[PDB]
Amino acid sequence: PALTKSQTDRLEVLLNPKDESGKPFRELESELLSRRKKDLQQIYAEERENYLGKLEREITRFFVDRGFLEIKSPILIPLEYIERMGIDNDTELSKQIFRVDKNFCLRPMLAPNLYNYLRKLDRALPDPIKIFEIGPCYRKESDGKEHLEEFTMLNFCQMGSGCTRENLESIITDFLNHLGIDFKIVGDGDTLDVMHGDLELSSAVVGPIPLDREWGIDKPWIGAGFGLERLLKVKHDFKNIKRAARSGSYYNGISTNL
Amino acid sequence: PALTKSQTDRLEVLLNPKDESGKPFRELESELLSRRKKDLQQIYAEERENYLGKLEREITRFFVDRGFLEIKSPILIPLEYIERMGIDNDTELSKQIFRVDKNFCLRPMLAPNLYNYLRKLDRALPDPIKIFEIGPCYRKESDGKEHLEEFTMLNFCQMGSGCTRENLESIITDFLNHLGIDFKIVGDGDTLDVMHGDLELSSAVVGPIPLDREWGIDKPWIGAGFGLERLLKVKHDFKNIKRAARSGSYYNGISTNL
Numbered sequence: 276p277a278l279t280k281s282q283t284d285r286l287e288v289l290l291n292p293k294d295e296s297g298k299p300f301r302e303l304e305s306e307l308l309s310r311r312k313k314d315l316q317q318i319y320a321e322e323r324e325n326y327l328g329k330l331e332r333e334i335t336r337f338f339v340d341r342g343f344l345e346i347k348s349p350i351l352i353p354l355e356y357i358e359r360m361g362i363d364n365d366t367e368l369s370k371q372i373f374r375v376d377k378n379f380c381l382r383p384m385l386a387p388n389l390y391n392y393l394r395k396l397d398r399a400l401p402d403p404i405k406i407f408e409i410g411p412c413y414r415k416e417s418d419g420k421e422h423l424e425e426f427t428m429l430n431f432c433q434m435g436s437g438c439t440r441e442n443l444e445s446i447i448t449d450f451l452n453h454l455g456i457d458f459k460i461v462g463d464g465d466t467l468d469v470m471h472g473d474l475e476l477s478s479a480v481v482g483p484i485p486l487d488r489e490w491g492i493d494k495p496w497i498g499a500g501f502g503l504e505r506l507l508k509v510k511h512d513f514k515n516i517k518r519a520a521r522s523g524s525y526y527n528g529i530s531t532n533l
Numbered sequence: 534p535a536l537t538k539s540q541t542d543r544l545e546v547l548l549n550p551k552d553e554s555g556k557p558f559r560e561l562e563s564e565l566l567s568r569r570k571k572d573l574q575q576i577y578a579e580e581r582e583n584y585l586g587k588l589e590r591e592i593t594r595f596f597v598d599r600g601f602l603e604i605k606s607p608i609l610i611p612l613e614y615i616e617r618m619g620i621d622n623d624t625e626l627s628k629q630i631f632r633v634d635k636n637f638c639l640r641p642m643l644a645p646n647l648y649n650y651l652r653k654l655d656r657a658l659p660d661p662i663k664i665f666e667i668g669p670c671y672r673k674e675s676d677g678k679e680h681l682e683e684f685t686m687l688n689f690c691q692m693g694s695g696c697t698r699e700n701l702e703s704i705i706t707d708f709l710n711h712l713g714i715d716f717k718i719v720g721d722g723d724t725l726d727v728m729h730g731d732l733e734l735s736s737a738v739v740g741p742i743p744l745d746r747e748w749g750i751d752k753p754w755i756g757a758g759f760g761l762e763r764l765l766k767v768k769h770d771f772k773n774i775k776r777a778a779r780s781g782s783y784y785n786g787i788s789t790n791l
């Protein structure tokens with residue numbers, strides 16, 4: 276008669292936001308299975324692009340076209356970078372770090388390598404310096420509804436002239452309107468949060484800030500970090516962020532357990 | 534008078550393959566510094582694309598256009614995958630593994646996640662199944678001239694019909710001729726090596742092989758794994774592979790220590 280909780284969970288795995296009682300679980304399941312196999316077949320026959328890779332390519336084109344230099348830096352970084360970012364056992368992030376060997380860890384954010392590039396590039400490039408990076412970041416997390424331990428961050432920034440809150444809000448606005456994602460910027464160094472309902476899409480700041488000194492900066496700057504899986508989650512109306520993650524269980528939000 | 538070894542090393546860092554005695558080190562260094570800053574300035578003014586990201590986009594287009602589905606799977610994987618790949622303390626790879634926590638490690642290759650996708654996709658996609666992935670892989674290494682501990686692999690494969698050595702060699706050939714990289718395929722499951730002089734660009738195999746059973750495959754297949762930094766090294770004539778790596782020290786092969 277009524278579906279068990281386990282049966283509902285199984286069907287939800289197979290349910291797409293798009294899909295719109297009376298028959299047994301086996302029938303409902305068979306219907307969804309056929310639809311999902313069909314979705315995978317269309318992808319294979321036409322586009323063949325992975326959502327996360329495609330979004331990265333689209334974001335890359337957006338920033339490159341706007342004068343930002345594309346950076347690809349190490350994912351495995353020196354543990355020293357963590358403390359240098361002012362992350363001490365006093366903060367939350369301290370215990371979210373995935374350590375590797377005795378001297379390294381998986382980057383929990385992009386900031387350290389971008390600070391290094393801002394400093395080095397200032398010796399060669401004209402003001403202002405505009406750069407960005409998109410790539411894997413890692414953090415141990417307790418939540419699984421809005422967080423992934425392995426996620427992908429976009430972090431863009433500009434240093435020198437034009438580093439105003441107005442310019443920062445303008446970039447964020449053109450960016451999200453380009454992607455077609457609804458948002459609200461909330462605020463009051465100057466820090467702002469880009470929200471979609473109760474979900475944080477990004478954290479942005481208008482420097483300078485005291486931390487800059489440790490990385491040898493000394494110029495004004497603006498920047499923002501966005502989670503690509505959160506952007507995909509909102510854009511594709513995925514109930515659980517796992518549908519937008521690097522995974523062996525979902526492909527473009529479609530269950531691979533068919 | 535004569536340049537010291539340390540001075541020559543400094544100048545080599547600043548030397549580009551392109552560049553073509555009498556004056557002091559300071560003069561030679563100043564000349565190279567100005568040229569390198571100019572190279573960075575042109576990149577910033579025009580293209581703005583990172584070599585490794587651009588190569589990945591170019592390789593992605595090549596395989597997607599040829600009917601291969603783009604995969605983005607986890608970089609942080611279960612340690613169990615390593616043993617399941619038949620990697621025991623008897624092999625070299627066993628000690629090259631970067632372990633994370635007690636149950637995970639950084640993927641040293643793409644094969645495990647691709648085996649999983651081949652098995653799952655066979656329940657939904659028409660024969661033959663063609664997929665590929667490009668992404669970070671990690672291995673502890675002793676060499677630094679041809680190896681990086683953090684590198685990027687391309688692994689494409691096809692399972693089902695058409696999985697012949699001839700088709701495999703044909704894909705490799707069209708691929709490298711598309712990129713403009715000279716090579717030689719050497720061989721005799723069936724295993725082949727794609728070489729550029731004494732440098733291994735890729736290892737490819739024509740299945741089936743005994744290992745397949747552990748991942749639930751049971752169909753013929755062909756595949757090959759390429760190192761993107763090695764491809765860049767050959768294409769741009771970089772003497773040391775570090776110029777092609779994710780790094781804070783080189784950008785598109787140009788030293789960032791100016």
Ligand SMILES: Nc1ncnc2c1ncn2[C@@H]1O[C@H](COP(=O)(O)OP(=O)(O)NP(=O)(O)O)[C@@H](O)[C@H]1O
Pocket residue numbers: 384414416421422423424425426427428475476477478500501502503504505
């Ligand atoms: N664990 C995660 N999984 C997915 N996305 C994340 C994760 N952590 C951070 N992000 C994304 O990266 C952006 C910038 O990182 P950060 O400002 O450090 O997030 P946070 O402050 O840790 N956010 P939160 O944990 O939701 O309160 C966030 O706004 C998210 O879009």
Ligand SMILES: Nc1ncnc2c1ncn2[C@@H]1O[C@H](COP(=O)(O)OP(=O)(O)NP(=O)(O)O)[C@@H](O)[C@H]1O
Pocket residue numbers: 642672674679680681682683684685686733734735736758759760761762763
């Ligand atoms: N440490 C590394 N650094 C850069 N590229 C690598 C590295 N290891 C493997 N590759 C690339 O990935 C391809 C496939 O990996 P694999 O066949 O496992 O290499 P291998 O057999 O370990 N090669 P090698 O170490 O040079 O004898 C290699 O042909 C290289 O192009």
Ligand SMILES: CC(C)(C)OC(=O)NCCCC[C@H](N)C(=O)O
Pocket residue numbers: 384385386387389390430431432478479480496497498499500
């Ligand atoms: C300039 C840089 C890269 C150091 O920072 C920024 O560009 N923007 C700040 C984003 C902060 C995101 C996240 N809250 C973090 O702490 O990294």
Ligand SMILES: CC(C)(C)OC(=O)NCCCC[C@H](N)C(=O)O
Pocket residue numbers: 642643644645647648688689690736737738754755756757758
């Ligand atoms: C089918 C699959 C992905 C399991 O393997 C291949 O597609 N090709 C073999 C490539 C081997 C590269 C490297 N030698 C490794 O062992 O992963």
Ligand SMILES: [Mg+2]
Pocket residue numbers: none
């Ligand atoms: Mg957090």
Ligand SMILES: [Mg+2]
Pocket residue numbers: 475477478
């Ligand atoms: Mg935040």
Ligand SMILES: [Mg+2]
Pocket residue numbers: none
């Ligand atoms: Mg090796």
Ligand SMILES: [Mg+2]
Pocket residue numbers: 733735736
């Ligand atoms: Mg090999």
